[model samples]
Target: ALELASTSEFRFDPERTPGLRHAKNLTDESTRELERVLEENHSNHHIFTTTEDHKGVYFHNHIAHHDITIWALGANPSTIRSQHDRNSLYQRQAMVIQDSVVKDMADPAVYKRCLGREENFLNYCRFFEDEINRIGYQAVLQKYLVDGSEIADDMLCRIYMGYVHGIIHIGMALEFKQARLLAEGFAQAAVHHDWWYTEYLTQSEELARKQEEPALPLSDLIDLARQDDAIRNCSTLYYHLQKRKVTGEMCLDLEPARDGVLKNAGPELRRVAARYRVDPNDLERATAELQNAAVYLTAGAQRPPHICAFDFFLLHSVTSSIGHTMFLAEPSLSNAQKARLLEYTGRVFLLSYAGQGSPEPRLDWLASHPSRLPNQGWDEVFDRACYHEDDGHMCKLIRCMAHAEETSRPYDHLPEFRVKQGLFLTAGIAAIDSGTDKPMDGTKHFDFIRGSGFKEAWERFPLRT
Candidate 1:
């Protein structure tokens, strides 16, 4: 009788491996336990077979597939320890919500509702704001953690407050189609104020250690800053305008720098001396004065004081310095005006870029292609905003809304109307998606196909990831 058999051998070589006692000391007990569990559950490993038609043979073997599955299944003892370490890190920087009654500001939901009916511009702007904020916050958080200490709650709040203002400034500038101006403004604001919250916290710590009487807290400063009538008026006007209920009277009240720190200086001076154009020496002087004023105002105070006067002065000084620097470097202006405009225009451009998205691409491009003069033209301004792939969609929409050679009016007047018309024409494609409740199969929407309204439609909406 003939018999077929397979033979295998297992052997351990002491020369090729360390002794068990030595290995035990080197590896963590939990890791060793995990390896034991994996070894015991060898059947959990996958097996794959390969066959060749020519050879008429198949091969199979238990194969290891590396994944977090063991961790998820709670089979690895070290997983819990890893998770605990991560949670501890996150908890150190997390904020606790205040239960006490403070101010009752209008809900963001209400603002969204009021503005939702307008063309999708505000929605798009909101999306952009959220994206930029998310990225900036992560970057800031990473920077704060470089020293192995987490960010402080007070510093986080201050950074968030500045970010909100930056977003608003950028959103408005974009809405007004002042792309270059907006980008320049945002960049200046970001660069100058980027380290402010962290610095403020450090200074506060120094003051606390010295037991200073005139030390100002971040909360007080933020509250005072928020109370500025100019900021309030702008917020209100923007809300109303977004809802299509803006009036000329309201517009006058909402005029730039109407009630904020910028008002301390004349609008002209504030406009020219914005955050973007202010020289380093000028900014240092302004920041020092503002810090002194804050210290003075906070002295002997139990409840935070509503000192809009001093707040506006400081805010204006900063804004003016920004405005002055911005306008001086603004590409649209003449050499004479460039010097004067640098302060404001530069801040606008900087803020705009900060608010919209990452400003690196725009700045890098500009570095290579320096403009001889500031570009006041809409096309040139929009070109700066159109630096990224996403901005391509915005540029296309802007072009469609713009008038031909006949009449040159600001886009705001007629763009919404054109956008609506465009939306209606393109609505059919949006309705055809499989997830959409509307007819997915073209048979149900035969009327849509026959109608002249949907002819040669281009799918201009951005693809979701």
Candidate 2:
């Protein structure tokens, strides 16, 4: 660690709050201050504050933490054991305790001991777990959780974001069944916030114009299923808008892991199929059910069954930050130059999320490149966003680079472009709407496809906090 706390610009003090051990200790005003501080810090994308928030912010939604409206929810939130915010997981035992005797304990005693109790906590976990496993986490989150929260996008965004992160907090201490269930809940909420914010992004005038264009006919938008990376790379809010909109029924697709299905196979997912094991051929269609039986054996698989909160967090974190720039191309430059620039500055984009880069890719070449490399306006801005301490300048650089040339759009979001971007996402084949014998593995014809998209990010996200 660079010990960023010693630096003057890092204004947050994780240790500032007097230690809070119980939800009862978090007063209304104190909780609001905590919420405001967290909102400002997270909005700024401060990486270190993940710990700062850990110390206190989990209380924001706690049963006692709620001011008034939260009381409407029939269920109670978790109780904290200490200032560390670390005891709720492994601290409780479910089956080991006699539920018969547990019935006699006070609500607080039961709450403290039965971390996985069905009525207070486990039931919701089980209900959400079934909901996630039933229709997948996205639906449970985007539809059910949103419905529970009353469907206010901003409030839901906060709740969804809050829910997922809270999973990690309690997940570590929870027993397996409860942890897994809670993890599912957290993961679902992560996608809920991600998909909801994306849909919300469509409301902006810049994106709103194309939200319902004639050329982009909305035929069976399931093809635009949130599962498609073609949609995943589309960050509608900032720029480099890839066409994204929301239909209420299919949000599970539009949500995170946009790759997986809602209400997929159960524990049988881990139990290998009696035949060629992958996933079931169960389609939404009962129409050809009998006819498709033979094909079911050879059908493809979707998710790997047990998806975790950390996995969901990885997509939410990076996807939100760079959806607009994922497949971005510099119009003024050739494919070769764009590839080279991405190679030179790839780590910078990673730095945007990871916060660990030197910002020194071409400092030597700013005024004069060795002539071995091509110089472009975006070159510096790209590297700076990766490593410089000042994020505001980094953001400005991207805008400047986006508009530096009148005819220079980043990459056209045409059909062909979308196709190519899809290939880039799945296989790192930089060409528009194309494929490769080998993708991010470096066998592709495109030189720039190295360490690309999910292939690269899969390796990256798990390694970080």
Candidate 3:
């Protein structure tokens, strides 16, 4: 096992106080167990698995998420080991692919050619492992992500696809200081083929670079995206539901609702996404805005009269934005790259907000919503998240919400934030309760209500008590 000291990196606020905000729950035992769990997963499992005997459906390996959840929640060693086994019960074993075949496909041409295919997933992992060992994950990422090429753009698109899975995997590696997971994360990106993200992100970036009208902050840009009927109403259940399921036939449609928005909105989204830009010098407040608005748009996007629940797609914006916080900790990343990351992240939030049908944020409704546990603070929420039986996303949700509460405090005085300081705690209360709520599907976890702007999605759940 790797030493806990060598395997993890934890961030603290300016004063280094426990409750100051953004502190992680990392014990030595939990940290070492995280290394062991990740190593075991990397050695044994395939990154993409065929689910339910269907060749069409692909489920990603959750090993990195397992490590992040355990370390972030401060799980004891037993919980780490037990949870690792529990989460891995249904995972598929890695297919034994020969290194000779992968060696030939190491070229960028072959990489782009094999974009959507999962057969070469292990092969890609091997290629990244060698490259990471030869130079470093930082150098490898700089080569593909910030190098300024079409292949680089494709790589970036993959990171944002699978609902931002690639970046989350890479972010986990960076956050916890696990270099080996970097190899796996890169491989994960190489195999994912979300071609549209290329056009969607690039066109907005091109427009953002040309615009001189001081770029708008995230919350304001969100309003613009919301106001556009063409963007907000593009992906409704009536037209996009069937189109959503079958449109991306080969690739995994993990969140069909999100796909409809991307497929339908087209070029209209690029114009709005371009309005929000990032400043390198102001990353502290810039990041705060991103994180705060992520939670705000996520928690506030409620259509009342159908009990409150977080959107599955929007919850990801909250979870994924924390990666930006972690990304800031890296010294190898230049200011330009960091600033660009923020811009791309902000654009994603705007697009995701539009995709969720851009519901008018009902902050007052959430603030007054009764919680299953009344008058409890973040401590109680953290306790439940640590031990909650979930696929692991809910724990990450609670952790991000807790962090956002602290980051968002200084910004509460501003009117544009729309989300007051108290709302973070209230949102956490509602999210944890919503996640634990039983749905009609007989599944114990109804963690997120998909497409909150649509009544059809809300009608799936029993009315809120």
Candidate 4:
């Protein structure tokens, strides 16, 4: 066991970083500020809520972003100090629910059925908290998530909802060992209303489960999806830039997107995505392949000579892909469960790629693409990311890319994996450079370009010869 532990390829050394894990300056004040931020978020607000007047517009919680950003900011203490006020002010929009309404749900019947109601969210949170405390987090996860039942289907599907906020939150909890965040992760998944995910993911997963032969690698499936004209063209002609006049800078509406590609592309998406299979014995390689494919699809889906930008939706999958690494690290999870998680994650990325019109991933162009920032190595990238302004997603993206570089490093020699060592750097530089550099002053800085699959989305930015 000692020899296995010492030699396992999946076992990564925390102290040795192939990429930047440097947090140069750390201070007691900033550390306390991070604690204070977590305390405020935990005590003062719910993960998802809305005010009475703006009932139509429901607010997705920012606590996850706050947690990641504040913790990450330790690397650049000066930025942590400067951004604390901005991060704190951002929290004011979240209104807390009364503790009177928050009650524990002990019965499976009570907890299992509340799949899409906001009122039951706190109840679910309390339930997950108690369950985790009593039985343990892994047991709770096994019973509720990987159990292979109807409720598990809904819960697992919902985890990928809200642009994968649920799993990412859970990922943070597991990575940081915060039980409250884990409770919130369960609750957030319970309350999310993206029902279509259940249909698409379940069907694809079913197909994968029935197949005995090891399926295609993730990148191959991506190529197959792109070549399949029907899947690639599943999204409606109405790309983000086309809808700008009606929705301002909001890009495409979620309702129409749900009605369009998600509704139409299920069969095609399921077939292609289902072709991705994970062998229990090969989980590490499979996980690395998933990450590599996510970066390939996200960074390569660009119109050349046009400023390289990532699709907003595809970017989330890349960030969310990191969660599987955390899941793999948990000793409590069986290899089969880890394999299943990798399969689900791979399918979701394929579905998301199809949703974005499966624009051909131009590896050559991405390799040759210029970064918007004056770039050298990841340390400078980390420093710049610490200061870059956004809702913390951009910083998270840069960080995730760096981590991807490290986690995927061992697989670089394998030709079939398509692991480009330099592309991570290029993609990170492109991401930091693509977004708006302006301060967060009540307006989104338009750092990301939404729906890069459609030609109309690329009309604004010209390709450089």
- Compared with the true structure, what per-residue lDDT tens digits does model 1 show for residues 351-454? 21111111111112111222323533433333322221220122222222121111112221332112122221121112111111232121111111110111
In TM-score terms, candidate 4 sits at 0.86
- The TM-score of candidate 3 is 0.85
**Segments of candidate 3 deviating more than 4 angstroms:** 1-27, 49-57, 212-214, 238-259, 437-445
CA lDDT, candidate 4, residue 354:
75
lDDT ranking, best first: 3, 4, 1, 2
- lDDT score, candidate 2: 0.23
The residue-by-residue lDDT of candidate 2 on 320-435, one tens digit each, is 21211211221222333223222212111221111111011111112121122244233333332222122121222122222212111233342311112111111110111121
User: Which sections of candidate 1 miss by over 4 Å?
Assistant: 1-126, 129-286, 293-465
Give the TM-scores of the predictions, in the order they appear: 0.17, 0.22, 0.85, 0.86
Q: Give candidates' CA RMSD values in order.
A: 30.5, 23.4, 4.8, 5.4
| Lowest summed lDDT window (length 10), candidate 2 | 294-303
Query: All candidates' lDDT scores?
Result: 0.24, 0.23, 0.69, 0.67
Ranking by TM-score: 4, 3, 2, 1
Give candidate 1's TM-score: 0.17
Candidate 2 C-alpha error for residue 227, in Å: 29
lDDT of 3 by residue, 262-289 (tens): 6677667877777787788887778888
Candidates 2 and 3: which is better by TM-score?
A: 3
